Design a protein around this ligand. Structure first.
Ligand SMILES: [Ca+2]
Ligand SMILES: [Ca+2]
Ligand SMILES: [Cl-]
Lengths: 385, 397
């Protein structure tokens, strides 16, 4: 009955953009006007999803204070991009990813508009915060307790008539937070109140196994920038002369020729349709970021993780192990025979398999992009009648 | 809505199964028990979508080699295999569900005889699905095809008619065969945007035009403003390496960057050395490439067409590569959303000039952008699930 003008505040990067786009499309499907702040790198992708784009220039084009400060400057960059573009015509709603939460909430404070937080990672409240656990494990102070960071945030927050102490503002919970995870994957899930919606992951003729009885393995380390020909060769060697059929997605940087001849039961591709392979897979060998792990569990496929290939993968990998949904290979266990052994043990573990099938069920019932849009619209109902 | 037991009856084949799958998942998300009739070839895909599988044995396992080179009555044989395939699905579903029928039968248009007979015998409401044009008293793609082929309606062929009268009678149906064939379902979910439908204005509220299930490690172009062409002929069982080589030749030493998706049956090594601005892959993520593309050169199946238009990319069509592509291809040309190349028009220079002309055509550009908006506003699986749940509310709450 109402068209809403909805502004997305998001940082550039595959991991931050991709999970959001299903929601952007479902809201545009519903007749809402989507504006989305991003860089030229993701502009075309965001427009294809149905949104109008506001371009910002990314900063990513004492080491931790510098990581902290640039983080602040990136929020400032997105903040100023959105203000200049929208100007004397505020949107109805600000939806922002956790990374630019400074930008998002300040836009909402400056326009007097409600906001929604988006997260493709674990939710935070007073009982669990992944960010607090990370700072702790690295012996870092909370950024708010860092003078140089604290100083800039005081200035920034004052400009926007915010007098809230920096550490508290930092820890405030949004009116609504859409969490793109199934609830059972969330640490301390039971403590998370009504303002948190665990909606799960957003998600060519496809690939078909050449031999219908063959156990299928998917190997992927994402679309890496740095190249691991050695690992893919070791995987090829590991499953040569076994009943397995192995599909290796090597990304857009590595030339499949580089891997040399492959046996007939191993295939390598820069790009593969992941879900079509996972639908047939008995296991998946992967880096273990949140995205990768949930795609596998959405298809009921147990995991062997190699989290040293992905820096973000640590918390997600840790959770997989914690829940008994997969195993992990250390960098000293990457000889072909070791890879084989780990994959076979995991694939044969019927306890892990049943846990993963229950996770598949929890993903399915989570609700997806349609529910995430229903949540957005419902929220707008409450704070904007 | 309370959990319902919903049965999907579908034929095997990517073009029939894939568009249905978004709806399957969205219904399963809502708590519904989904059972889905298919073959082993698609059993994994359907299970991953959230359905339990009832297997059937396809006539097309062994009707591969009987009809390739025709003797006289090949036309009649084609109709008879269609009927047998409907019967294969009907028998499998009845055997599997036995004395415990589902609450609702959702059938694809190809097995409509199976779907409607299951619904009659079980005394249940039914929903029709189609990935192609809807039919009513004003328009029927099949009637136009038979007409253009100079062949009789299958109901007017003696061998087919006799089988069908007998089968219908076994389900307490004495409706004349041709009349029955044309009856309109209580609800039809059409996976097309309404504007793409011929005689769209004549379709009443029993037809929901929900559009294609939408698309979306991302591929990036080599320069920000590189003109990008996507070339795809689908997952061709046939080797057309010459065409891909011709495409590569066409754009060598031009600023274009060409991405060729050659499918899972062709080794890209077969193509030989490619120019540095041309890349070939068995699989590519179509959406990532289309988001940057200025044009798409494609066979013109309804699936591939709507994918291109979802991204606002105009098409150059080569429909002779896919017999299934003629209706969609003709619609694209009729609407001015693309051009077409014939078999004699496939020399490299012909390909390059055709693509350049199409990509520069502002009028096409604008009509395609209107089609993109239609598709984006069509509603998709969430709307399709809403329509199914609402229909249940009315006819079997
Ligand atoms: Ca891009
Ligand atoms: Ca299959
Ligand atoms: Cl129809």
């Amino acid at each position: 009955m109402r068209q809403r003008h909805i502004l997305f505040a998001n940082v550039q990067g595959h991991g931050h953009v991709y999970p959001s786009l299903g929601l952007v499309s479902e809201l545009a499907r519903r007749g809402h006007r989507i504006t989305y702040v991003t860089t030229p790198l993701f502009a075309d992708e965001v427009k294809a999803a149905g949104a109008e784009v506001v371009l910002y220039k990314s900063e990513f084009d004492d080491a931790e204070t510098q990581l902290h400060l640039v983080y602040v400057r990136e929020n400032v960059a997105i903040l100023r991009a959105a203000e200049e573009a929208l100007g004397d015509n505020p949107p109805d709603l600000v939806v922002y990813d956790v990374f630019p939460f400074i930008a998002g909430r300040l836009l909402a404070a400056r326009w007097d508009r409600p906001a929604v937080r988006l997260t493709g990672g674990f939710a935070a409240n007073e009982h669990y915060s992944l960010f607090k656990e990370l700072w702790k494990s690295n012996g870092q102070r909370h950024p708010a307790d860092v003078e140089a960071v604290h100083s800039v945030l005081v200035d920034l927050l004052g400009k926007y008539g915010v007098d809230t102490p920096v550490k508290e503002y930092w820890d405030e919970i949004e009116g609504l937070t859409i969490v793109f995870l199934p609830k059972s994957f969330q640490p301390f899930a039971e403590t998370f109140d009504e303002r948190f919606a665990f909606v799960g992951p957003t998600l060519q003729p496809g690939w078909q196994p050449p031999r219908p009885d063959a156990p299928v393995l998917l190997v992927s380390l994402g679309n890496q920038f740095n190249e691991h020909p050695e690992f893919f060769r070791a995987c090829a060697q590991a499953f040569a002369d076994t009943p397995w059929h192995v599909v290796m997605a090597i990304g857009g940087f590595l030339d499949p020729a580089v891997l040399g001849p492959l046996p007939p039961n191993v295939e390598a591709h820069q790009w593969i349709p992941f879900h079509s392979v996972l639908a047939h897979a008995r296991a998946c060998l992967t880096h273990g970021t949140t995205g990768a792990v949930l795609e596998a569990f959405a298809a009921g496929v147990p995991l062997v993780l190699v989290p040293h290939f992905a820096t973000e993968a640590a918390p997600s990998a840790e959770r997989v192990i914690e829940l008994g949904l997969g195993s992990v290979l250390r960098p000293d266990q990457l000889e072909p025979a070791s890879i084989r052994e780990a994959v076979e043990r995991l694939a044969a573990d019927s306890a892990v398999r049943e846990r993963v099938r229950r996770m598949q069920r929890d993903i399915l019932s989570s609700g997806g992009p349609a529910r995430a849009a229903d949540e957005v619209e419902a929220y707008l109902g409450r704070v904007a009648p």
